[PDB]
Amino acid sequence: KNVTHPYWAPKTWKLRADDITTIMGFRAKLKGNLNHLDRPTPTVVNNAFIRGFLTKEDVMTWEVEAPYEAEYNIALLYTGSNDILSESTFEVTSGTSKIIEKANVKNWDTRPIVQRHYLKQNLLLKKGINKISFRLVTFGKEKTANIKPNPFAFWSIELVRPEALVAIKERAKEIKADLQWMVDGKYGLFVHFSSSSVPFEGGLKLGDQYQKLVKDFDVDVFVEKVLEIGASWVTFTCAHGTQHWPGPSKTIDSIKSGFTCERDLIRELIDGLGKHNIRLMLYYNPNSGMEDLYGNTYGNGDQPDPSGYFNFLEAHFREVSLRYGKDLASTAGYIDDGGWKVYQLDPPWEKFVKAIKAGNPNAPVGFSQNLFPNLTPFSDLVVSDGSGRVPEIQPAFLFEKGGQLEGQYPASWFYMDGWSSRVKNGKFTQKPKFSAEKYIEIFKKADQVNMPITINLAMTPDVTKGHPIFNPESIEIMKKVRKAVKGYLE
Ligand SMILES: C[C@@H]1O[C@H](O)[C@@H](O)[C@H](O)[C@@H]1O
Ligand SMILES: C[C@@H]1O[C@H](O)[C@@H](O)[C@H](O)[C@@H]1O
Ligand SMILES: C[C@@H]1O[C@H](O)[C@@H](O)[C@H](O)[C@@H]1O
Ligand SMILES: C[C@@H]1O[C@H](O)[C@@H](O)[C@H](O)[C@@H]1O
Ligand SMILES: C[C@@H]1O[C@H](O)[C@@H](O)[C@H](O)[C@@H]1O
Ligand SMILES: [Mg+2]
Numbered sequence: 408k409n410v411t412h413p414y415w416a417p418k419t420w421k422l423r424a425d426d427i428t429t430i431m432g433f434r435a436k437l438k439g440n441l442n443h444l445d446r447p448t449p450t451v452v453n454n455a456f457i458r459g460f461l462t463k464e465d466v467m468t469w470e471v472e473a474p475y476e477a478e479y480n481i482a483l484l485y486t487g488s489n490d491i492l493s494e495s496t497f498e499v500t501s502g503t504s505k506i507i508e509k510a511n512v513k514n515w516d517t518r519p520i521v522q523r524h525y526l527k528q529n530l531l532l533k534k535g536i537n538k539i540s541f542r543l544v545t546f547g548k549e550k551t552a553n554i555k556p557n558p559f560a561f562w563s564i565e566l567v568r569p570e571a572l573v574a575i576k577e578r579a580k581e582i583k584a585d586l587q588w589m590v591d592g593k594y595g596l597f598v599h600f601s602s603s604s605v606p607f608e609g610g611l612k613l614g615d616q617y618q619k620l621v622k623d624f625d626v627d628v629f630v631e632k633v634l635e636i637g638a639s640w641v642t643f644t645c646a647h648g649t650q651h652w653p654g655p656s657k658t659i660d661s662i663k664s665g666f667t668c669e670r671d672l673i674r675e676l677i678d679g680l681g682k683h684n685i686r687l688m689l690y691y692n693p694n695s696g697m698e699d700l701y702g703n704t705y706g707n708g709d710q711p712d713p714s715g716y717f718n719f720l721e722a723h724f725r726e727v728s729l730r731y732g733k734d735l736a737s738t739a740g741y742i743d744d745g746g747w748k749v750y751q752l753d754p755p756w757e758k759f760v761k762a763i764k765a766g767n768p769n770a771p772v773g774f775s776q777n778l779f780p781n782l783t784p785f786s787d788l789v790v791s792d793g794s795g796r797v798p799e800i801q802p803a804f805l806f807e808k809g810g811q812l813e814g815q816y817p818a819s820w821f822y823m824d825g826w827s828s829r830v831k832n833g834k835f836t837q838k839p840k841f842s843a844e845k846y847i848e849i850f851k852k853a854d855q856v857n858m859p860i861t862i863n864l865a866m867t868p869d870v871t872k873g874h875p876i877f878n879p880e881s882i883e884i885m886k887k888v889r890k891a892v893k894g895y896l897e
Pocket of ligand 2: 647648649692695743744
């Protein structure tokens, strides 16, 4: 009863013998109870999990193509009730090769919710077409809003020759970013220049008058507020809701006109913030409005092909990174939905990372991993949407060898009042979530454990002298935060 548009349907997967190959569960043939949410169009569907592993007949089968006979290390990504996991046994088969292994219980209280399980024994694969099957052979049950169930939910399988993994990890280690400047700066400002946002003075949402509002953006007004709250960096939102880009881009323009600006606002933000040694990183969203820029990520025509889209992302990262060089701290401080959306295309993470660092070899890579474990060994920062909640403190063993987050460094991304400003009738509708004293404790804790915080204060897309661009109550709180954390202490 499961539905997949041809671009999402099961197909034979080419193994990349020198790389980590990832294959979503819905690329397997499913039998028995196994099911997933419908995927009826070329557009990615976040909720990709396979559910219904209830009996020994509930089995999924991929078809993969190896270039030569070799042993492959298998990782599984899954989630579910610890009650269910504590009694689930996995079985991975191909040819005569068979792996049997108990599931791992999630013994941390934080994200990641999905865990990556490296199976101890390797799977031998013959040259050419191999069928690989996954099923459970022992089963648990949930025990005592406790309404929604938490079944075993399979996300993906990952295949990598053990020798390729050592070499991959070696290279990741050699280009790992040095984040001391973020720890020393303690916190920065997330600013959403959001295409859905309506200006303080009313009128068209930023998305429908993007170039005009970029041309009228008052950098000096913006920098003085950033400076006043003591931010050490700014993460600035490119392509939030549409693919509009606040500066020149040969890469974007060669796909489709109308998204770029004559004014190089990124450069002016660099220079304006640079006068006070405040650094700039870029948020970028590779999916929102992408159907109006590139089109379907898997292209047109009868069979899915992501190389055009991959080449766009790589050429875009590369052009931005080289355009600004070391003046731009990162063209990829926050790449939205790396977990929910980007991961589902089995993308070439390393090529993206090399593009990101081409102009700035220490540029931190921050793919948003959502509730998922580390997306690629070439990550630098833990990144996900903290909403307006108190920042979680992930326990240290997550970062040790074998850990879910190994190679990453802890970091928090959350908002004081909201993400996108919702100003209506000259009044901010989004108030700070907590008292000033609670934010002070939050930043003091982040500082004591050397975890950078990037806090969003909803900003009016029309940045001018005529009106507060941030909520004055929010500014007042951050001024008290600055005093308690960055001010003269005694
Ligand atoms: C054979 C596989 O086909 C898919 O469409 C791609 O997304 C994979 O990266 C690989 O090329
Ligand atoms: C730009 C925004 O990014 C988020 O990740 C999405 O979930 C929103 O709906 C919107 O697309
Ligand atoms: C067969 C598929 O149908 C869809 O409607 C199209 O958007 C795809 O690109 C492809 O042509
Ligand atoms: C702007 C540059 O960003 C890089 O990521 C940093 O490592 C450098 O110290 C410099 O500040
Ligand atoms: C940083 C946040 O990322 C999330 O994925 C989005 O849904 C929010 O709008 C915001 O942009
Ligand atoms: Mg510190």
